[PDB]
Design a protein around this ligand. Structure first.
Ligand SMILES: OC[C@H]1O[C@@H](c2nnc(-c3ccccc3)[nH]2)[C@H](O)[C@@H](O)[C@@H]1O
Ligand SMILES: OC[C@H]1O[C@@H](c2nnc(-c3ccccc3)[nH]2)[C@H](O)[C@@H](O)[C@@H]1O
Ligand SMILES: *Cc1c(COP(=O)(O)O)cnc(C)c1O
Ligand SMILES: *Cc1c(COP(=O)(O)O)cnc(C)c1O
Lengths: 810, 810
């Protein structure tokens, strides 16, 4: 059908059809008369997977032969989503498979909808890791993603009576055709025990052993025949574990619980023992695998020339003391040499400045679980603080501020400080965030070692986030500038010369309109909900958090509602306001916010005076596969965190690539997006970081806004009085109390400007041609936000390797 | 190479080779330069499995079309062993695969040794189920085996310092290529809850739900293209189970523990809740599947014409009240009609008369776990006892003896009584056992319903237990009488006309000698143990139990040792005495017996005066794959249980088929074996059942034997004094005390006759030609003990279906 989707040659189509029937028969053990759509999905998945394995084997053979520097990306989260369509896109097989399945009497889109998301992440950090893997393969890097194979990923969200309920995400129930178990490369990981000092160094003994079994998933580059590996570890008990007899076998679950479930917190630290075990488990198994591969080429001098380890936040920070442990205790390098190697190997990426998100582990935990690592951390701290004291003599407060050990009620280890000390590079994830790190929380470290600190602005992969989810848009773009932009996103600037082209203006707008129709039909089909497809689709999809300010959006929605009720017969630009995202199960305020959103919907959506001029929909179970549907359908992207809180954001970039305009604060990557497109082509409002700091110095008093803004006071009175909860008038008292007395994110302070800016949005939407022209200017300048750009910078500035766009042979 | 192993045609060999390379590449994702022998094993297994699926699909299609009566064999145990060689044998692929692998540079035997046993059974009962499945497929019956897919089967036995240690049998670690998960046919099973009575009958409510997920394994018939199904259930938690959040996910293990581990008791009842859950789980999932299949053809009148359910002992006895539950509560049949259907559908097989093995469940357990089933059982009991009272008026003691409810300290349900009441046929497993049932423990039931009681003497499959494990013997036999005997074992009688044939005598003896050499080499290779291959191989392999009297064997071994030490320069027929088998982990006396065996070995094997005239070897980790090695190598089969205790035995039959002579008591199937071969061709000794009864009436006094038999007294003094445990002189005090004061199995009473009979064995072994002639007479009359004969009798006399030897089309 469409050009970007590749060739459908007779030979290939014939071959695909026979391999599909072969898998249906021999692999699935079904005949056509009993096969369900799920059986068909699996036959297709195995058929496409067969095309990966050849290139996978020869890629890994190639790295063995040529022995390039290897990049190891260590993350506790990989939010992969679905694999089938991505694999087809990257192998140029989509049209052929479409043809082959069509000829067998099947709709491929329908089969694609059967695949479960691999939901092994919470949101942006996990999804960034997934985008990065795709870019690293596309750029020809010898890269491996290492993580944990959770049996249960991020929970499935149901809404019952307006409240979030959580269900286990049993994503492996029907099997995962993409992975390959590798039980032959199982590795032991140690816990507990004690340290023994001998004539010849320390020994960690009397440990409990848990086995780490790997599962490998292929990661195909874009049409270059590179297939890299994501290796995920699964916990297994040894066979003599606890070895009355029956109970000892049942107690194997204790050991195997390490890989059972993903902690469902986004931007929050929960200091539980099981989480610490997960962090050490991934680190200890991964480092043995790295060292094995390195030896299979005594001289650890060359280790940093052949290995880079990238720490995705502090979650795998134990890599630093584990590497020292291995080098000093097992390989018997002297301390100084070991530390040099470690520092040159490791680099650390920070993704947040929120204090409740920073990992600070109680010493008593590490002492019990990882007694040798604690000794090593203490030794690192002592030597690091000696360097500080020599650079800043007599500055005793600096010593206590920079220490890896925090004193207080309970002593804790600051994992961010450990990561800075033991890494040759530290980066933030957008220019403003990186500056904030140097100015505030890591200021002392920056003064000591300015050369360590860098920026690497985040990006998203244009394979998944344009070609795959928005083929219509990719096509009309390819018609004008060709296909090269898919792996060189800066070529989208060529689109600026079509900004006055009436044909292009029309096609851009038609593609959006079709995306909106298809999403509106999705809603009815799957959720019995009826929306006006001519309305402005105003969307805020991201995890539920106070700092992301879903509440500020809610205040606007109610304002629109009240203005309609005040002047019902006055014209307003119709909107469909969509908000979605998951709340962490223990985050009470987030759960209340969800309930508020549905409650506003209950009132607004059933008010005859409103009509279809305003609809408020809570999008259930937001996840990668839903993002690929709603993002191409959006007109307005809500990126409204308090300035200084959203380290980067990545949803923002997805919307910009897909033809939505952005309303947002000058926060995270929003600043660079506005800079790339021009501020005139962005709806910017609110306090800058400097204004927030000024307000904090003065003292934020919310009462003042309530007193001076009647529209705001009215909303608060509606909330308190039970207008949105008739049967339980005090239901939202916690929300009102927070907004009025302890709002850390200053919702009221940005209200007036937000509402005004939203009026300017409605004004522009009334003039379709000018809206579309501004859209074209956004799409055209979105190139900087390709993760290919991001990974090229990591590669050159941190890892010391050159990317390559050269194909390997097929 | 050999004829019985099938054709190695150029086309087939070429095809096998390409499919092997295809699986190595696409299935295993390996290249030849990294592949290990395990990868090669898996490539072969997938290649052979491909040849099954076609016939599997068309067999099951065929049963759908023709709708024959279906046979459901319900067992908690299926002791399958290895699958690869069996599958090749049954498909006529062995020589082709041998050729194909040879041409790829691989030894197929070596690859066969990599496969794990499926050890989902304890011993004879589980292995009988496996033999039965093979025969039912070979005889063309529409049969399904239903059980539990245990994650851990029977434990791996290690011997440390002469003591048994248990290790978990993680048999699924590397994957199981033979099974196919069928998550689409997952079924709910209910536990706990309470019963509600309405206007319209009882309702079982507030239950906890556990899901039953099936896994299907193919069961190929012998060269008839029939492939039947063994469906094994795995426990899964529902996704809203327990649904703070993390703990709720981790607590899914509670539900999933049901299918975690096989209870490792042979002939012993352990009344634990988890075991009861396993029993109900298999029954409840299986019966829904049966009823689904029956409806997919309102009229339950025809249910017994289309369904037979065979209960493998009482372990699945809850099928009876579950069937009533479904018919009465869900389908709303009246009680009397439901009971008629149930009785005509169910048949019960008893496998033991040992009182400690009989299942008697505490009412309080059933009351909590299965409250509706308890109500149904009470109702069955009341109506059954009304029939008893009407047939035997005023016989109040009969009423209490026959009740399903046992009164006492705790009230219990007698599951054997439930099974007799609710089955149209009840059988024992050898003629003497079946008579014992009618005379003793089920006498009252036999008087009430004599027509129910039958015999079905056990058998073993001659595919696994001759062709597969002893190809050399199968060949020399096929040279004379052709190949038809493999599926018509009675044809072995034709061998009686070769009893005076000097060529045949020589070939039989050479085959044995080669089996012995190959087993002696196995021992060195794998266990650094050096044995004389010219010695008589005297073997006792079976589970360790007091009733099997491994101790009587030990007493003989020590007698031989003492006689040598008394007259060292006198000639004796050299023996290698081999004893193997597992002890249940909680069975203290069994564990002591193992230690005694190794301790005797420690003394005997290192005594220079003995030389290589006597060796005592404990065979570690006895299991199906070890049985296939040691049984073809044996000269003497020890079948020495106390008369009346071994219901049948099946090991006995395996040895007879493979050219060993038997020393044994008149117990179980030994009686029929002696009858078939002629008593002159059997080494029978000891009390008959009648003599045991006489001794029990008088009172067994062990002291009397000790007083009158000096050789016995000497052994007991050696045991007590620490001769076999120098460092711990009192180590075997428990054993001595049991033998002297509370030996339920009368070891001393058979000692004199056992020793005398063993002298007659040694005398015959000194004359090779006459030994071999007696062997030929055993092999030639072993035909009755084919499980094909057994299953034909079940089919005609219990299930009401005719077997067929007709092939389906390939
Ligand atoms: O750089 C990728 C994205 O990381 C997110 C993030 N920052 N910290 C976490 C986090 C912290 C603890 C647990 C799980 C996730 N997630 C940030 O909040 C986003 O601004 C950013 O785009
Ligand atoms: O008929 C097959 C074989 O069943 C065995 C047997 N009888 N009861 C059990 C049993 C009882 C409880 C748990 C596990 C197995 N096993 C008998 O002891 C054997 O004589 C018999 O050959
Ligand atoms: C991109 C993405 C996110 C991150 O969105 P932000 O708006 O940057 O928080 C979270 N969840 C999913 C499923 C995504 O695809
Ligand atoms: C046949 C067999 C048994 C049963 O042997 P008996 O001597 O009848 O108890 C037990 N275990 C295994 C592994 C077998 O093959």
């Amino acid at each position: 059908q469409i050009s970007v989707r590749g060739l459908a040659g007779v030979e290939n189509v014939t071959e695909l059809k026979k391999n599909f029937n072969r898998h249906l028969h021999f692999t699935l053990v079904k005949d056509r008369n009993v096969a369900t759509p799920r059986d068909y999905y699996f036959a297709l998945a195995h058929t496409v997977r067969d095309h990966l394995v050849g290139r996978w084997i020869r890629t890994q053979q190639h790295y063995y032969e040529k022995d390039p520097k290897r990049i190891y990306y260590l993350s506790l989260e990989f939010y992969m989503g679905r694999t089938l369509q991505n694999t087809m896109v990257n192998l140029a097989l989509e049209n052929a498979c479409d043809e082959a399945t069509y000829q067998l009497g099947l709709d491929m889109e329908e089969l694609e909808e059967i695949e479960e998301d691999a939901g092994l992440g919470n949101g942006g950090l996990g999804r960034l890791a997934a985008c990065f893997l795709d870019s690293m393969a596309t750029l020809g890097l010898a890269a491996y993603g290492y993580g944990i194979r959770y049996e249960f990923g991020i929970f499935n969200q149901k809404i019952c009576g307006g409240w979030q309920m959580e269900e286990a995400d049993d994503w492996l129930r029907y099997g995962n055709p993409w992975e390959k178990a590798r039980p032959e490369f199982t590795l032991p990981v140690h816990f507990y025990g004690r340290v023994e000092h001998t004539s010849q160094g320390a020994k960690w003994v009397d440990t409990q052993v848990v086995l780490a079994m790997p599962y490998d998933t292929p990661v195909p580059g874009y049409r270059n025949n590179v297939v890299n590996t994501m290796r995920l570890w699964s916990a297994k008990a040894p066979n003599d574990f606890n070895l009355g007899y029956i109970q000892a076998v049942l107690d194997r679950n204790l050991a195997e619980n390490i890989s059972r479930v993903l902690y469902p917190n986004d931007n929050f630290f929960e200091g539980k023992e099981l989480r610490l075990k997960q962090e050490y488990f991934v680190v200890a198994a991964t480092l043995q695998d790295i060292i094995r591969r390195f030896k299979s080429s005594t001289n650890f001098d060359a280790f940093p020339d052949k290995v880079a380890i990238q720490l995705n936040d502090t979650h795998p920070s134990l890599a630093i003391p584990e590497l020292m442990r291995v080098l000093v205790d097992l390989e018997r390098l002297d301390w100084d040499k070991a530390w040099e190697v470690t520092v040159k190997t490791c680099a650390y990426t920070n993704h947040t400045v929120l204090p409740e998100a920073l990992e600070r582990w109680p010493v008593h935990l590490l002492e019990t679980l990882l007694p040798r690592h604690l000794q090593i951390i203490y030794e690192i701290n002592q030597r690091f603080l000696n360097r500080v004291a020599a650079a800043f003599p007599g500055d005793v407060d600096r010593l206590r501020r920079m220490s890896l050990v925090e004193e207080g009620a309970v002593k804790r280890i600051n994992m961010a400080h450990l990561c800075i000390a033991g890494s040759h590079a530290v980066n933030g994830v957008a220019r403003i965030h990186s500056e904030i790190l140097k100015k505030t929380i890591f200021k002392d470290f920056y003064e000591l070692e300015p050369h360590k600190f860098q920026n690497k602005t985040n990006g998203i992969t244009p394979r998944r986030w344009l070609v795959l989810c928005n083929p219509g848009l990719a096509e009309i773009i390819a018609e004008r500038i060709g296909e090269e932009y898919i792996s060189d996103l800066d070529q989208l600037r060529k689109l600026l010369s079509y900004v006055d082209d009436e044909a292009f203006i029309r096609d851009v707008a038609k593609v959006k309109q079709e995306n909106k129709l298809k999403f509106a039909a999705y809603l009815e089909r799957e959720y019995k909900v009826h929306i006006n497809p001519n309305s402005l689709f105003d969307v805020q999809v991201k995890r539920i958090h106070e700092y992301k300010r879903q509440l500020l959006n809610c205040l606007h929605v109610i304002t629109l509602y009240n203005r309609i009720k005040k002047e019902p017969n006055k014209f307003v630009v119709p909107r469909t306001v969509m908000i979605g995202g998951k709340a962490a199960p223990g985050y009470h305020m987030a759960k209340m916010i969800i309930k508020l959103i549905t409650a506003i919907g209950d009132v607004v959506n059933h008010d005859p005076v409103v009509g279809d001029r305003l609809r408020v929909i809570f999008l259930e179970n937001y996840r990668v596969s839903l993002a690929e549907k709603v993002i191409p359908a959006a007109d307005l992207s809500e990126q409204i965190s308090t300035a200084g809180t959203e380290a980067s954001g990545t949803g923002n970039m997805k919307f910009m690539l897909n033809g939505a305009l952005t309303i947002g604060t000058m926060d995270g990557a929003n600043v660079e997006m506005a800079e790339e497109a021009g501020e005139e082509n962005f709806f910017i409002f609110g306090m800058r970081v400097e204004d927030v700091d000024r307000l904090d110095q003065r003292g934020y008093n919310a009462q003042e806004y309530y007193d001076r803004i009647p529209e705001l006071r009215q909303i608060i009175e509606q909330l308190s009085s039970g207008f949105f909860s008739p049967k339980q008038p005090d239901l939202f008292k916690d929300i009102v109390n927070m907004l009025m007395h302890h709002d850390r994110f200053k919702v009221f302070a940005d209200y007036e400007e937000y509402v005004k800016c939203q009026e300017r949005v409605s004004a522009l939407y009334k003039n379709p041609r000018e809206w579309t022209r501004m859209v074209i200017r956004n799409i055209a300048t979105s190139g900087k936000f390709s993760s290919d750009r991001t990974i090229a910078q990591y590669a050159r500035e941190i890892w010391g390797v050159e990317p390559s766009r050269q194909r390997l042979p097929a």
